[PDB]
Amino acid sequence: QGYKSVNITFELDERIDKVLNEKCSAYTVELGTEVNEFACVVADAVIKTLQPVSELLTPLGIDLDEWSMATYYLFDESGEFKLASHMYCSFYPPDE
């Protein structure tokens, strides 16, 4: 028995990038993890550990209200659902 853990990038670029990439970017998949539950799981980890602060996050520059209400899509190349070492978690479709 073995778990397949990988690193994901959810909106991270020039803010909280290395912080959450090193702290909460390695999740367990291939044991029954999907892509939709992957977006909700990454969103839940970041929203559960980083959200209880708010005091430093609101003057910092981010809103923190669009991370809990708005969900992101996970893709590897162009826009396909595949499991790789480094997956991209970002928004691509239009907003209604």
């Binding site: 912080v19 702290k23 029954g32 999907e34 539950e37 799981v41 980083l50």
Partner: protein, 73 residues
């Protein structure tokens, strides 16, 4: 000013790069929220953590792929 002890700036002067990576440490303004809450929620025994991330969900990702459910209708 404000800070005198603990935490250093690292490197300030530089012209000829050799390693490229390695200024002083990690994060400058995100270290407060990261260290405070990430270590505040920690209740497990370890003290010396080298690699972060091992487990996240078990009942949320395994129950969705094993038993499909419909929403709204």
């Amino acid at each position: 000013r404000n800070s005198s002890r603990n935490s250093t700036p690292g490197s300030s002067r530089g012209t000829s790069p050799a390693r490229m990576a390695g200024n002083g440490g990690d994060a400058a303004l995100a270290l407060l929220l990261l260290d405070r809450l990430n270590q505040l929620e920690s209740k497990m025994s370890g003290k010396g953590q080298q690699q972060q991330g091992q487990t996240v969900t078990k009942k949320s990702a395994a129950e969705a792929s094993k038993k499909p459910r419909q929403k709204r209708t």
